[PDB]
Amino acid sequence: AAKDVKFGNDAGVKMLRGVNVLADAVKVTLGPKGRNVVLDKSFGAPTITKDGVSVAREIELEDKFENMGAQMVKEVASKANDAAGDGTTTATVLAQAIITEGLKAVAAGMNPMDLKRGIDKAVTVAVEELKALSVPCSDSKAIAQVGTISANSDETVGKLIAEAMDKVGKEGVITVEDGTGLQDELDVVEGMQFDRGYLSPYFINKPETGAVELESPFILLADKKISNIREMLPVLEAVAKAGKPLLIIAEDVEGEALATLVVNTMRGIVKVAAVKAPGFGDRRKAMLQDIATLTGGTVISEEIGMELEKATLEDLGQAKRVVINKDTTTIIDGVGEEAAIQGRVAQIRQQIEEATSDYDREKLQERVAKLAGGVAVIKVGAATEVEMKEKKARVEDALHATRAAVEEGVVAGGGVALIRVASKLADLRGQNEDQNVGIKVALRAMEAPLRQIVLNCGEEPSVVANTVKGGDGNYGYNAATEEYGNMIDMGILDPTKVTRSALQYAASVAGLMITTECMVTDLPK
Amino acid sequence: AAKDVKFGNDAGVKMLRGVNVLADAVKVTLGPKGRNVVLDKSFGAPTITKDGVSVAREIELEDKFENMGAQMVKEVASKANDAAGDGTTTATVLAQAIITEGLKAVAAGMNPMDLKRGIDKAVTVAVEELKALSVPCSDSKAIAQVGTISANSDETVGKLIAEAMDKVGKEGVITVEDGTGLQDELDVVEGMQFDRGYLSPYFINKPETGAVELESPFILLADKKISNIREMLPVLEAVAKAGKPLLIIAEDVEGEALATLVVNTMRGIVKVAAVKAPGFGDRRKAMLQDIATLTGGTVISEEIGMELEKATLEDLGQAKRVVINKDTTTIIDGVGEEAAIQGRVAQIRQQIEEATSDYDREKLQERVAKLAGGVAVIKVGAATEVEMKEKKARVEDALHATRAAVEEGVVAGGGVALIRVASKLADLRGQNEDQNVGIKVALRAMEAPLRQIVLNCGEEPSVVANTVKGGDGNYGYNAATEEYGNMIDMGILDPTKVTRSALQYAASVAGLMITTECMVTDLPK
Amino acid sequence: AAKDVKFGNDAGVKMLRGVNVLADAVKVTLGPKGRNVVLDKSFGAPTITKDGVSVAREIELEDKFENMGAQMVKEVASKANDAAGDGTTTATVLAQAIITEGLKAVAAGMNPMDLKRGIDKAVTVAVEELKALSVPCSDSKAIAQVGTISANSDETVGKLIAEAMDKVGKEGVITVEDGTGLQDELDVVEGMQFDRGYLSPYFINKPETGAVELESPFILLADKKISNIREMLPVLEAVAKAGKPLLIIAEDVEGEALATLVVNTMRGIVKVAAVKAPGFGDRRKAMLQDIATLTGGTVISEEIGMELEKATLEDLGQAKRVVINKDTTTIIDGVGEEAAIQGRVAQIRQQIEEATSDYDREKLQERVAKLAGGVAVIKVGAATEVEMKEKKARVEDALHATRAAVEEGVVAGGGVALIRVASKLADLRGQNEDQNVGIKVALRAMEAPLRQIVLNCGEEPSVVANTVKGGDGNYGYNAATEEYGNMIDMGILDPTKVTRSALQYAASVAGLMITTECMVTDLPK
Ligand SMILES: Nc1ncnc2c1ncn2[C@@H]1O[C@H](COP(=O)(O)OP(=O)(O)OP(O)(O)=S)[C@@H](O)[C@H]1O
Ligand SMILES: Nc1ncnc2c1ncn2[C@@H]1O[C@H](COP(=O)(O)OP(=O)(O)OP(O)(O)=S)[C@@H](O)[C@H]1O
Ligand SMILES: Nc1ncnc2c1ncn2[C@@H]1O[C@H](COP(=O)(O)OP(=O)(O)OP(O)(O)=S)[C@@H](O)[C@H]1O
Ligand SMILES: [K+]
Ligand SMILES: [K+]
Ligand SMILES: [K+]
Ligand SMILES: [Mg+2]
Ligand SMILES: [Mg+2]
Ligand SMILES: [Mg+2]
DSSP states (O other), rough: OOOEEEEHHHHHHHHHHHHHHHHHHHHHTTTTTTEEEEOOOHHHSOEOOOOOHHHHHHHHOOOHHHHHHHHHHHHHHHOOOOOHHSSSHHHHHHHHHHHHHHHHHHHOOOHHHHHHHHHHHHHHHOOOOHHHBBOOOOOOHHHHHHHHHTTSHHHHHHHHHHHHHHHHTSSSOEEEOSSSSSOOEEEEEEEEEESSOSSSSSGGGTTTBBBBBEESSSEEEEEEEOOOOOTTTTHHHHHHHOOOOOEEEEEEEHHHHHHHHHHHHHHSOOOEEEOOOOSSSSHHHHHHHHHHHHTTOOOOEEEEEEESTTTTTTSSSEEEEEESSOEEEEEEEOOOOHHHHHHHHHHHHHHHHHHHHHHHHHHHHHHHHHHHEEEEEEEEESSSHHOOOOHHHHHHHHHHHHHHHHHHHHEEETTTHHHEEEEEEEETTOOHHHHHHHHHHHHHHTHHHHHHHHHHHHHHEEEHHHHHSSSTEEEEETTTTTEEEEETTTTEEEEEEEHHHHHHHHHHHHHHHOOOOOEEEEEEO | OEEEEEEHHHHHHHHHHHHHHHHHHHHHHOTTHHHHHHEEEESSSOOEEEOOHHHHHOOOOHHHHHHHHHHHHHHHHHHHHHHSSOOOOHHHHHHHHHHHHHHHHHHTTOOOOHHHHHHHHHHHHHEEEEEHOOOOSSSSSHHHHHHHHHHOOHHHHHHHHHHHHHHHHSOOOEEEEOOOSSSSSSEEESEESSSSSEEEEGSSSSSTTTTTEESEEEEEEEEEOOOOHHHHHHHHHHHHTTTTOOEEEEEOOOOOHOOOOOOOOOOOOOOOEEEEEOOTTHHHHHHHHHHHHHHHHHEEEEEGOOSSSTOOOTTTHHHHHHHEOOSEEEEEEEOOOOHHHHHHHHHHHHHHOOOOOOOHHHHHHHHHHHHOOEEEEEEOSSSSHHHHHHHHHHHHHHHHHHHHHHHEEEEETTTTTHHHHHTTTTTTSSSSSSHHHHHHHHHHHHTTHHHHHHHTTTTTTHHHHHHHHHOTTTTEEEETTTEEEEEETOOOEEEEHHHHHHHHHHHHHHHHTTTTOEEEEOOOO | OOOEEHHHHHHHHHHHHHHHHHHHHHHOOSSSOOOOOEEOOSSSEEEEEHHHHHHHOOOOOOSSSHHHHHHHHHHHHHHHHHHHOOOHHHHHHHHHHHHHHHHHHHHHOOHHHHHHHHHHHHHHHHHHHHHHHOOOOOSSSHHHHHHHHHSSSSSHHHHHHHHHHHHHTTTEEEEEOOOOOSSEEEESSSSEEEEEEEEEGEEEEGGTTTTTTEEEEEEEEEEEEEEESTHHHHHHHHHHHTOOOEEEEEEOOHHHHHHHHHHHHHSSSOEEEEOOOSSHHHHHHHHHHHHHHHHOOOOOEEGTTTSSSTTTTSSEEEEEEEESSSEEEEEEOOOOHHHEEEEEEEEHHHHHOOOSEEEEEEEHHHHHHHHHHHHHEEEESSSHHHHHHHHHHHHHHHHHHHHHHHOOOOEETHHHHHHHHHOOOOOOOOHHHHEEEEEHHHHHHHHHHHHHHHHHHOOHHHHHHHHHHHHHHEEEEEEETTTTTTTTTTTOOEHHHHHHHHHHHHHHHHHHTTTTEEEEOOOOO
16 A cells, blocks of 8 residues: 655654653553553443553554554563563653653754664663662572562562472472462472463463463373364364363464464364474474473374374373463473383483583483472462452562562662662763763663652652762662652662663664654555 | 623633743743843844843733733833832742742632732731841941942942942932043032932933933923913923923923923924922922022922913023933932022021921921932943943942842842742741632742742752752852852842842732732724 | 744744745855845846845845844844954854754753853854964065955055055055046045944945045034034035035934934935044043144034034034045045144144053054054056946955954965864863853854855865865865865965954854744734
8 A cells, every 4th residue: 555654853753752642651650659541441431550551552543653653662561571571661761761862862963873872882881780789689588578578568478489489499480379278388299381382362361461271281292383273183072072171282383273273262162272392403302202201191293103183182191280471381280100200300310411512411401400390389378269369469470570589689669770870870981972972861761760750759850869869879769658768678679670671672662763764654544 | 892801710811821921931031041032123133132121011912811911910020120120020930920829729719818818928927037137238348249249240330339328328319420531430419319200201212221311401390280382382492492401390291281292302303301390289399499499490380470481591490411210300410509509408407497397307307318418420431432331331230239238138149038038937827728828829939039040040940949948048059150159158149129029019919810800801803 | 012922942943944044045155156146126127146245135034033033143244244344154154053053952952051151162262263373464565465365366456555554554544536547546645534433324425335425525523412403504504505515523413413414415405424523531522623633623612612503614624535434434634734733743742751541641642643644545547437446446345355464364265264273172172061062063163164165166065174174274175266275375365353253243143042042023913
């Protein structure tokens, strides 16, 4: 269709207008005094929310060029969401502040490529400096503290997460399930988690976690690409009869076969979800086998001349529960016998002795850790169904934050970390004056989150910013009580991982828009 | 003609909009970093100015209700200008701050009369307090200091003003004239100043001072009202022949006769200006006579059966110079002989002995002081015509500030004095909640001048206001260097009188607008 | 009338667009390859010109705000023009370049007052540095050279100007008149020049020089202000009878009397021109007397009780010729006898011995030099009336440039001097970053004149600018021949005084525009 094409400044003003509608809608919800945003729904009451990502999803604009700007900067929240699971609003605030000053510098005649280089240099140094401020979260006391804080001061949840991490290691797999009664339970089951997510968003049966959850499912382990539905028919009907759901772990599920699984789990017919097998090449087969051993299944590979047509319910593996994210599959309580599994471990453990290369060694150690480690299962107890679904959600969130904390530690919240970082970089310089302006654009942007939190309180950003900057270390502003003090002592912490992601994705998308010269869109027609 | 009529809120929003355009245009010029305002002129290059009064005179708005709010608030500046001859921009900023928050309170349902009452109570107490803060300017050291500081640190100008005040008293008449050569000259001549201005603005031959200036003019002293030009004709033509200008001092110059004088000095035909005779009733005649004795003229009064037709050049008085303002006439160097004047002084001095009432005594003492006081003439020396017109202007301005200082003392400049006054009134309460709101409106408005000074620097008004409020006394912000310090030691002082006037005029017009319910104007038609 | 009022950015974009129309019209005519501009006239053929001033005078714009920006910047050309008499196009190109980048720096958020401070600092340093580069023009060889070059390589004209300067000194008075025949004549007559111009442009009888020229006039020397025509009547009629013109040298000629002289020399009735008397105060009377002595006239002062009514043709002085500019009066060949004049000289020369102050000494030496120095008269010979008016024009222009060269010397033309000065200032810094951007603005603008000369040639500005920047000293681009070389050896010189004026008036009006926050004009109605 015929296009509308815009260049330079014409395009920049449209982009900036769109980013501003998006960011301005989102940013009112930042921090403890965030304001509500009302989102219209086609039936019944509108949604009232303080959640950045809910607002951003609804933003689409009529002017097509403004719309492109909103959708580009929206990619900042979702990327920060996917990498750290928090900080999408902080990321949008940082993005609008960089884009705004960046595009003003461009309109003033400064070189967009230098501006970007300066932003990137500041970001690179800011991130090193964030790591140097990060306070580690390594012992179970620290873990329990963070978990307590993330669970709205519920010391129970903190103890639980610390206990789970103590059983499987802070890098171990932990899930949470509904409790059976009043008290919390923590057990370790045979299980495993690997880095593959669902092959279509449609398999998601729980939009609240954006996840796929299956109970007592059969697991098809196919060592090949599935293109034809034909191959599946006999196994699918056999599973239909036992009344259980099916997890397909294949080398891949492509077009035709996937499209059918999507349409057929959509009409309730059979509950099937498909993920890619972990790894690639040689180690892929070995790993498929690890899963087989764990779930008591049998790898159906074309190398031994086995067909999917000639596969019964006995070939399929089984587990009590499987959960799959955008990019994770976790298999909880596999049927595989302790004999077979422990025997498999001993095999791999010997491969480690015969390994003639570090690379092969690490790859093997990873397999053993997954196979011998199992999965911690937190079962959340409560008095009623309602209190339970609620406590479960708190445990899930608290776990998520604590995990982030364990990885890269914690830094002062309320946007003080980025403010301290920016002041350590006052002397940072680049190769020329435009790069220097770029550096300053990014240092200035780093105050935006603190300023917006203050603004949402009804206080003066410039006064609070200036006061915070005039102290040091963990001194900042507690926006819930409206007092200054030590952020760590007050329990206002951000996982370093979230702060670092929000900054990095903000600067990344911003540097793409600051170096955009031309925009192409359909004619409004 | 048909009227448009608005009430309540509809009226309030129009008034506020009008005030805002006027105040916004004027306030950019405030203080050392005031910005330029460009004023269009129908011929040649526009006027570029940093002077509030120049801006304010040009403002007139299309919408007739908005225009009414601009013109009501302009009354602030012009009355502060008439009373204290400085501070009109400060006055305009205080007025906008009061009006803005007062009208918001009204829109919120608070009682306008209580708001006004609260504002008024605050202003009353603020003015007592500004007198307590005020530092006297009474001795000739102080007067030289203030003069020096108002002359851009020119100690020469400070010495001259102190010398002139030492000759004629700090309440005596002082003028400045062009020097004859390189050095300054101070002499005392016979002369007098009285509280009557021109009878039409059209006599103004020097729009730069808004004044009327006449050189070696004849002075007609007529003890009656002049309605007919007929009477004047014979005296007017006799004056026309001598080639000198004429000052008419009559009991009044009404309609017909005035209209003619206006038209005839307009076409350059004869240079004539008219003022009312000073005082009223009995003392008016005796005062007319004092002027006569001073200028060597003869009172033409109808009580002795004298006509204006039978008056020659010999009857008229004379002086080297007369200057007339909106509400002052000053006669410089009258021809009257020292014998006659000194003899008249002695007469009045005896009347003071015979006086049987305080009131008659004081009135008589006033006359003697004027007749015996003379007029100090400062002649400004310089190397070139350009340097002299410049140094003359500095002396004029310094003289004007010093006079104000001598009446009411001096306080910290840079808006600090009103901030110190506000903070002392934090506990001030009225009869009810609305009145308390009124008080707060006024105390908040008292910050506005410091804030606007700061904003014109390009700095952050809330940060500086916060810092200055955290200090005390004379601590404040020097907007020329951008440093904090002691306002007095840094030489940044305002005459108390100008601070007081700005505030009282601002509050006065703001209270009228806040209690306005209805506006009537012509239909745009 | 009702006003339109604009603020900030809305004002800045209007200003800028009006400056661009004006400067774009003017700048095409810069340099040896300047292009033609066609100016409509209401009757007959349009005017075709390469003269910037001519273009500027016609520029008026419909949008009242853009018109204000044109009229402001036109003040640059006319102030350069009054101070130096050349360089107005250069000055307009410098202003456009400073305003353009200065308003873009404001739009980007930079503090206008700091921007202006930076520009002023660069200009102040640039001017010092121009002085350091200036090659003197002090001996008569250099004077002849510069004369020759300013006269389109006419060595004749150069010799003449050098001979005239040799007779009366390089600071002496020199005029040019029509020759009587074929050869040039140079003689020295009794005469004098003083710093007072005409009191109205209407006395101009020669619009080609914008000058007033009077032949064998009477000279009224009145030591007082003339307000009334009455006083003049008897002297005016006495002059009317002798059939000669009259020059009025009074303390001033104000409103009424001036308006009449304007109207009466306008209808051909009597040829009268009026100028202020030189100096002020005491030395004014002494100086009035010097003129009297020179012209054989008699001072009519009111201090000795003399009237203008009682003045005959015998009281008036006389001279063969007088010429009056916007700000100069020159009296050529006064009738005064050598006895009286030489005797007056001896008097003053004694005052110099008795002088007890340097100031009084210099003032006296100035009077002797004027009275004893006379006036060099260049009479231009030619073969026909046409060739003579033409040669006379060349001599006038050459003289004017040579005089400018003698005061402050000469620098490389072609915009090279400013480019050399800009590169010496690369390290110049101010108090903050916005001041530094200011400095850069001004250094970038200093390339504009060379780049616009180049652009007028149809060559590439950046290539030429870069090549000139890469050499040094007087290396530049000869835009007549399109070759690089040594600008001084090629004879492409600018008087330092014109380059300095152009740059200072440009920066001065540009700094006012940059710090303009608000504009007020009549509603288009
Ligand atoms: N008492 C507090 N005082 C100041 N800041 C706080 C306080 N409590 C939490 N915060 C800060 O609030 C910010 C988090 O606000 P949120 O509203 O969750 O937005 P976000 O995490 O940036 O984006 P979402 O949640 O993905 S939408 C973090 O910087 C916290 O440090
Ligand atoms: N260095 C300074 N720092 C802060 N304030 C100053 C400084 N110098 C003068 N001022 C203040 O600036 C204010 C005077 O500003 P102006 O521009 O004259 O306007 P104004 O008197 O209120 O109104 P005008 O002159 O009639 S228009 C006073 O409050 C001074 O004390
Ligand atoms: N051959 C040349 N090559 C380069 N520049 C030259 C040459 N001859 C003269 N110029 C320069 O041209 C500039 C002057 O051009 P003009 O057109 O007179 O403009 P202006 O003097 O800037 O403005 P006017 O005359 O008052 S309109 C000076 O910079 C001269 O040095
Ligand atoms: K939120
Ligand atoms: K001002
Ligand atoms: K030209
Ligand atoms: Mg969050
Ligand atoms: Mg003032
Ligand atoms: Mg020229």
